[PDB]
Nucleic acid binder design. Structure first.
Length: 409
DNA sequence: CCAGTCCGACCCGCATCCCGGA
DNA sequence: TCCGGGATGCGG
DNA sequence: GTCGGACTGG
C-alpha cells in the first residue's frame, strides 16, 4: 500500500523508480534509474508496509542507481547504506526504510533537472578551463573577448508566453523576488526580440557572495541586487558564434539607457595571453573575482548534464593557505563511506572538513582503515595541511571551496 | 591510446520549515 | 511564545 | 563550487 505513494515498479523486492531519460552531447539517449533495496544478514528481504513504522534488526536500507548510454555499458554506483532514521527522538521520526525512500525520492525529483530532453528553461553555459587559455583561442578569425568575473549568483532571463519574466538559475530553479530586476527586464523586453535569453550575474559590488546568494535564494529580498548581462542567445540558434552574440547583446542595451539595475558586462579584446592576464590583475585590483575569456567562435553550449564549454576560460586567483590538522573523519554515502576526510581548526577555534585532493579513493579507503585516534594523535595531529581554496568565509574565516592538496613535509 | 563526457561524492553559507524545551 | 536544533535544498 | 573514476568516441 505504502509503496504506491512513490512512482515506479516493485519487483524482486527491489523498488526501481521509473528511468529518467536524457540526451547526451553525442546524441545518444541515456537512462538513469535509482533503486531502493533492504538487506538483512547479507541477503535481500522484501519491503513490508510495517518497514515504514518499525526498523528490522540488522536491516540496512541500500540506495543505488544505474546509468547507461543506449546499448552501452551499465554503470552501477556503490550502495548508499541507510542504517538509521532521522529526527529519531521526535514526532517527525522516520524509519530506516522510510528515510531511504525520502532520500531516493529526493534524488529522483532533482535529477530530472538540467537534463537534455522544460518551461523553456535552458541551463546556462559553464566554463571548462581554469587559469588556462588554450592557444586555439588566438588561432581564430577574431580575437577572444575578456570580461569581468563577478562573485555572485548565475541567472538567465527570458519572457514566457504571458508577459511574465522568468529568472532561473544554474540548475534551472526559478528565482523568486528580485522585483527590481524583473521590472526593468519587463521594460527592456518591450524594445527587443521577445525570445532572446539574457545570460548574466546577480551581483552587488563589495557585497560578499554569501549575502548575494542569500538575497537571491530567499522568497523575498531587499531589492538591492543588480543583473550584469554578459551573453545572450536564442533557443533555435545556439550555434551562433560568441562574437556575434556579443554584438547583438550590445545592440540590445542600445535600446534603453533608462536602466538602473541591468547593465551589460564590458567586453575587452585581447590579442594575446599577456593582455588577458593584465586585465585579470586589473580586475582583481578593482575587487572583482577575476576575468572570463570567451573564444570568438564558440557557440552557446547549455549546461546539459553539467557540461562545461571548452570555448570559455576562467582566470581567477587560486589561494593556498595552511591550517592545523586536528581530527579526521569519513564520508557517509556511496563511494565516500570509509574514505578519509581531514578536519582542521582555525585560530578562533572553529573547525571545518576538507576533502583530500590528488589522492586516489584507494588511498582514502586505506588511510581511514589503518588509522585510529591513538595512531592519529601520535603522528598527524598538529601538522600543517596545505589547502587550496577560492575565498575565506567572511563571518568565520573558514576557507571556502577548499580541498586538501597535502602536508608541508 | 587519449580527451571528451558524465556521474556521484564532498566542502561552507544561507533560507525555510517542523519541531519541542527554556 | 520564542529562540535553538534538525532536516532539507538552494547557491558557490 | 570542488574533485576522482568510469565510460564514451574515436
Amino acid at each position: 500500500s505504502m509503496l504506491n505513494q512513490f512512482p515506479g515498479q516493485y519487483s524482486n523486492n527491489i523498488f526501481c523508480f521509473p528511468p529518467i531519460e536524457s540526451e547526451t552531447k553525442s546524441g545518444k539517449k541515456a537512462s538513469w534509474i535509482i533503486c531502493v533495496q533492504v538487506v538483512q544478514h547479507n541477503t535481500i528481504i522484501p519491503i513490508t508496509d510495517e518497514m515504514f513504522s518499525t526498523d528490522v534488526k540488522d536491516a540496512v536500507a541500500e540506495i543505488f542507481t544505474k546509468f547507461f548510454v543506449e546499448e552501452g555499458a551499465v554503470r552501477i554506483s556503490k550502495m548508499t547504506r541507510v542504517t538509521e532514521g532521522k529526527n529519531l527522538g521526535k514526532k517527525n521520526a522516520t524509519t530506516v526504510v522510510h528515510q531511504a525512500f525520502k532520500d531516493a525520492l529526493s534524488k529522483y525529483n532533482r535529477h530530472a533537472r538540467q537534463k537534455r530532453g522544460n518551461r523553456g528553461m535552458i541551463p546556462p553555459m559553464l566554463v571548462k578551463y581554469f587559469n588556462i587559455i588554450p592557444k586555439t583561442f588566438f588561432e581564430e578569425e577574431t580575437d577572444p573577448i575578456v570580461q569581468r568575473k563577478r562573485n555572485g549568483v548565475r541567472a538567465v532571463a527570458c519572457q514566457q508566453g504571458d508577459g511574465c519574466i522568468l529568472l532561473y538559475s544554474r540548475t534551472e530553479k526559478e528565482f523568486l523576488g528580485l522585483d527590481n530586476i524583473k521590472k526593468e527586464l519587463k521594460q527592456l523586453y518591450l524594445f527587443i526580440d521577445v525570445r532572446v535569453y539574457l545570460d548574466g550575474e546577480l551581483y552587488l559590488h563589495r557585497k560578499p557572495l554569501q549575502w548575494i546568494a542569500g538575497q537571491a535564494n530567499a522568497k523575498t529580498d531587499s531589492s538591492e541586487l543588480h543583473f550584469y548581462v554578459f551573453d545572450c542567445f536564442w533557443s533555435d540558434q545556439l550555434q551562433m558564434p560568441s562574437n556575434k552574440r556579443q554584438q547583438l547583446l550590445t545592440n540590445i542595451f542600445k535600446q534603453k539607457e533608462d536602466l538602473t539595475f541591468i547593465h551589460q558586462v564590458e567586453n575587452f579584446s585581447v590579442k594575446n595571453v599577456d593582455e588577458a592576464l593584465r586585465l585579470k590583475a586589473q580586475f582583481i585590483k578593482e575587487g572583482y573575482e577575476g576575468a572570463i575569456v570567451r573564444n570568438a567562435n564558440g557557440p552557446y553550449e547549455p549546461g546539459y548534464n553539467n557540461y562545461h564549454s571548452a570555448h570559455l576560460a576562467k582566470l581567477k586567483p587560486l589561494l593556498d593557505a595552511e591550517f592545523i590538522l586536528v581530527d579526521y573523519t569519513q564520508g557517509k554515502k556511496g563511494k565516500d563511506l570509509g574514505a578519509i576526510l581531514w578536519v582542521c581548526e582555525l585560530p578562533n577555534k572553529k573547525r571545518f572538513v576538507v576533502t583530500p585532493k590528488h589522492l586516489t579513493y584507494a588511498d582514502r579507503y586505506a588511510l581511514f582503515q589503518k588509522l585510529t585516534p591513538a595512531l592519529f594523535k601520535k603522528h598527524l595531529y598538529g601538522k600543517e595541511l596545505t589547502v587550496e581554496y577560492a575565498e575565506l568565509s567572511p563571518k568565520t574565516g573558514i576557507p571556502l571551496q577548499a580541498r586538501a592538496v597535502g602536508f608541508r613535509e
